Design an enzyme around this catalytic site. Structure first.
Site, PDB file in Angstrom:
ATOM      1  N   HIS A 124       0.458  -1.033  -0.188  1.00 36.55           N
ATOM      2  CA  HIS A 124       0.087   0.354  -0.150  1.00 36.55           C
ATOM      3  C   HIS A 124       0.864   1.013   0.052  1.00 36.55           C
ATOM      4  O   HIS A 124       0.240   2.514  -0.005  1.00 36.55           O
ATOM      5  CB  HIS A 124      -1.097  -0.285   1.004  1.00 36.55           C
ATOM      6  CG  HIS A 124      -0.277   0.064   2.589  1.00 36.55           C
ATOM      7  ND1 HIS A 124      -0.577  -0.615   2.840  1.00 36.55           N
ATOM      8  CD2 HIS A 124       0.568   1.369   3.175  1.00 36.55           C
ATOM      9  CE1 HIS A 124       0.036  -0.144   4.688  1.00 36.55           C
ATOM     10  NE2 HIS A 124       0.626   1.174   4.502  1.00 36.55           N
TER      11      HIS A 124
ATOM     12  N   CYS B 206       4.350   1.062   9.266  1.00 37.90           N
ATOM     13  CA  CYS B 206       4.129   0.035   8.397  1.00 37.90           C
ATOM     14  C   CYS B 206       5.363  -0.259   7.938  1.00 37.90           C
ATOM     15  O   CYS B 206       6.348   0.225   7.585  1.00 37.90           O
ATOM     16  CB  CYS B 206       2.803   0.248   7.166  1.00 37.90           C
ATOM     17  SG  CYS B 206       1.391   0.514   7.869  1.00 37.90           S
TER      18      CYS B 206
ATOM     19  N   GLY C  70       3.455   5.580  10.081  1.00 37.88           N
ATOM     20  CA  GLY C  70       4.814   5.425   9.395  1.00 37.88           C
ATOM     21  C   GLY C  70       5.116   4.058  10.095  1.00 37.88           C
ATOM     22  O   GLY C  70       6.597   3.588   9.300  1.00 37.88           O
TER      23      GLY C  70
HETATM   24  C1  LIG Z   1       1.150   2.090   8.333  1.00 39.68           C
HETATM   25  O1  LIG Z   1       1.717   2.585   8.803  1.00 39.68           O
HETATM   26  C2  LIG Z   1      -0.278   2.371   8.694  1.00 39.68           C
HETATM   27  C3  LIG Z   1      -0.595   1.971  10.045  1.00 39.68           C
HETATM   28  C4  LIG Z   1      -1.167   2.348  11.469  1.00 39.68           C
HETATM   29  C5  LIG Z   1      -1.079   3.606  11.444  1.00 39.68           C
HETATM   30  C6  LIG Z   1      -2.200   3.894  12.965  1.00 39.68           C
HETATM   31  N1  LIG Z   1      -1.621   2.557  13.857  1.00 39.68           N
HETATM   32  C7  LIG Z   1      -1.011   1.765  12.512  1.00 39.68           C
HETATM   33  O2  LIG Z   1      -1.325   0.591  12.979  1.00 39.68           O
HETATM   34  N2  LIG Z   1      -1.127   1.298   8.539  1.00 39.68           N
HETATM   35  C8  LIG Z   1      -2.705   2.227   8.110  1.00 39.68           C
HETATM   36  O3  LIG Z   1      -1.870   3.185   7.907  1.00 39.68           O
HETATM   37  C9  LIG Z   1      -3.311   1.617   6.402  1.00 39.68           C
HETATM   38  C10 LIG Z   1      -3.109   1.848   5.120  1.00 39.68           C
HETATM   39  C11 LIG Z   1      -4.339   1.686   4.431  1.00 39.68           C
HETATM   40  C12 LIG Z   1      -3.733   0.274   4.714  1.00 39.68           C
HETATM   41  C13 LIG Z   1      -3.912   1.594   3.310  1.00 39.68           C
HETATM   42  N3  LIG Z   1      -4.922   2.319   7.323  1.00 39.68           N
HETATM   43  C14 LIG Z   1      -5.044   1.880   8.424  1.00 39.68           C
HETATM   44  O4  LIG Z   1      -4.367   1.101   9.227  1.00 39.68           O
HETATM   45  O5  LIG Z   1      -7.180   2.768   9.144  1.00 39.68           O
HETATM   46  C15 LIG Z   1      -6.031   2.747   9.808  1.00 39.68           C
HETATM   47  C16 LIG Z   1      -5.857   4.428  10.729  1.00 39.68           C
HETATM   48  C17 LIG Z   1      -4.936   5.425   9.578  1.00 39.68           C
HETATM   49  C18 LIG Z   1      -4.665   5.976   9.746  1.00 39.68           C
HETATM   50  C19 LIG Z   1      -4.461   6.572  11.034  1.00 39.68           C
HETATM   51  C20 LIG Z   1      -4.834   5.894  12.674  1.00 39.68           C
HETATM   52  C21 LIG Z   1      -5.423   4.876  11.634  1.00 39.68           C
HETATM   53 CL1  LIG Z   1      -6.197   4.205  12.495  1.00 39.68          CL
END
Ligand SMILES: *[C@H](O)[C@H](C[C@@H]1CCNC1=O)NC(=O)[C@H](CC(C)C)NC(=O)OCc1ccccc1Cl
Ligand SMILES: *[C@H](O)[C@H](C[C@@H]1CCNC1=O)NC(=O)[C@H](CC(C)C)NC(=O)OCc1ccccc1Cl
Lengths: 303, 303
Positions: B41, B145, B143
């Site tokens: 992603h 992931c 950040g």
């Molecule tokens: C990647 O870095 C991120 C890890 C999340 C960010 C906040 N805590 C985490 O574990 N993944 C994502 O943002 C993910 C992207 C999609 C897979 C395209 N989406 C997601 O986790 O949705 C929930 C989210 C997104 C942004 C901020 C907080 C949260 Cl809970």
């Protein structure tokens, strides 16, 4: 989001761990530049261990009495000296993996990461708080002495703990890297008791703020109290008194949540008097005091 | 003695973490030999994120769309491909710090260490259990992931987890290093719920054995029960059923303590029915299920 007890990545310290052998005793040493640091009781024997005279014992040693091993490579000792309860072995090779480092002594209530090691080989990593009674609640087996505790701050490793002993209660005691014990303990095979302990109030409050930031709000209330009135409750439950500087350290957390420190103290008061009534906070059913305000800010800024 | 939740030393994995940038999105990658692995992603934009077609998105990318950074050194991408939910970026340099490694998928109830990373730079290390519902209870911010989970076994790193997302309950979901999700989750910005969870019975029993080895005996009793009778209690409290193989895995702990597994199950039964009555076990006021029998044996053999 989420809040977990978290150690610092241990790689920079892993590159410093060696094995130190003297006679039949083997423990861990910390190799920085051309000096290896380890507990001086490596020079003890089964008879001296009850109350040894370490100056005598070291005078009777020579550089060849010390077998130092950096993995498979044997390190040549070219000098030895004692600094308090730490032995310093000068070696013919500077550790090429030496990080930027400081030797720092920490205060009760502060945390650090422990890299548990056996035979010079790192085994595991975990976080410890220095208790008010100068013990730590670690996990150490025979052969773990010389394992170190540390914090990392912009690629600089601040070493604060070297492991020397276990007490009868199952808690652990050691020195700073200058060899000076934390607490009223001595490095010999005697039954030593730690003083009574107390709960680190500012850390409990920091953890309550972590809980709010992560969505645990059931313990909050509309009440606010005063510093003097809270400290009366603190003494009754064996909690440290809250100072104005503690309120100031908690400033950023109070700011991020919009909950004044004395507002949160009212919640802590009710928690102490009523318990949790079957509920949990950040996955615990008791009040946790081993997270500093700094530890919480490290995980809770983006939430 | 002492029993602490302990991560594996993270050094071997620290040497593999890089930063991967595509467009305005930056996350972490895992650099092994001449391949960097990261969540696919990273190629999403703010519009695609609701339900992107990743095959389309990758066809529209070129090697120069990917900025890979190993600290300060920029790595040149010479090929890209998709494997399930993981992107594989071939680079012109083999990582000289590549450890001996395997890609392994773990089972619910098993544990691993997580090296939390931001912008390619390791931030902290902690232990996680794969829940029966295929989530983990981590600590991840924006950040994070591409941070990975792993176990270490005689200098071989078994990678088992790459981080992709957070769920509305605050728990976390990701893939194995083949890019296959743990659980019924998908990598897009939708509100996804985990299934109901359950308590890992064999782990609770292992932790009760850890407690005995460390001197917590107040919950023991003279009673013994049968497997079938215990599993009736397990269903009532949302605990997994105990199998004969679980009894066999707990064999060494039962041997070291002289307490049969079905003797310990009687203690667990009473704990579930009566609670703790204000007492603690290994510093917890609830029954802990995130330690495997292996995790306990690792810390409790010398005691
Ligand atoms: C990647 O870095 C991120 C890890 C999340 C960010 C906040 N805590 C985490 O574990 N993944 C994502 O943002 C993910 C992207 C999609 C897979 C395209 N989406 C997601 O986790 O949705 C929930 C989210 C997104 C942004 C901020 C907080 C949260 Cl809970
Ligand atoms: C050094 O490796 C060792 C660490 C102990 C061993 C078990 N858990 C630990 O933390 N230190 C000592 O053995 C120390 C030596 C004296 C300072 C000379 N003595 C000590 O800790 O006494 C208690 C002890 C000793 C051996 C086994 C268990 C215990 Cl609790």
């Amino acid at each position: 989001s989420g809040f977990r007890k978290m150690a610092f990545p241990s790689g920079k310290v892993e590159g410093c761990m060696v094995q130190v052998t003297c006679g039949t005793t083997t423990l861990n040493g910390l190799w920085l530049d051309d000096v290896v640091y380890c507990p001086r009781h490596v020079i003890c024997t089964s008879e001296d261990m009850l109350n040894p005279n370490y100056e005598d014992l070291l005078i009777r040693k020579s550089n060849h009495n010390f077998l130092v091993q950096a993995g498979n490579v044997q390190l040549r000792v070219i000098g030895h000296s004692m600094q308090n309860c730490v032995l310093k072995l000068k070696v013919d090779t500077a550790n090429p993996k030496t990080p930027k480092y400081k030797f720092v002594r920490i205060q009760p209530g502060q945390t650090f990461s422990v890299l548990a090691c056996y035979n010079g080989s790192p085994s595991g990593v975990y976080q410890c708080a220095m208790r008010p009674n100068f013990t730590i609640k670690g996990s150490f087996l025979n052969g773990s002495c010389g394992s170190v505790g540390f914090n990392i701050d912009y690629d600089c490793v601040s070493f604060c703990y070297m492991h020397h002993m276990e007490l009868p209660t199952g808690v652990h005691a050691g020195t700073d890297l200058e060899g000076n014990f934390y607490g009223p303990f001595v490095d010999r095979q005697t039954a030593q008791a730690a003083g009574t302990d107390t709960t680190i109030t500012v850390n409990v409050l920091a953890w309550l703020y972590a809980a709010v930031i992560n969505g645990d709000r059931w313990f909050l209330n509309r009440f606010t109290t005063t510093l003097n009135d809270f400290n009366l409750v603190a003494m009754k439950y064996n909690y440290e008194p809250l100072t104005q500087d503690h309120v100031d350290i908690l400033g950023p957390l109070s700011a991020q949540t919009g909950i004044a420190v004395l507002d949160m103290c009212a919640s802590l008061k009710e928690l102490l008097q009523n318990g949790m009534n079957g509920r949990t906070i950040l996955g615990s059913a008791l009040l946790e005091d081993e997270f500093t305000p700094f530890d919480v800010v490290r995980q809770c800024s983006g939430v």
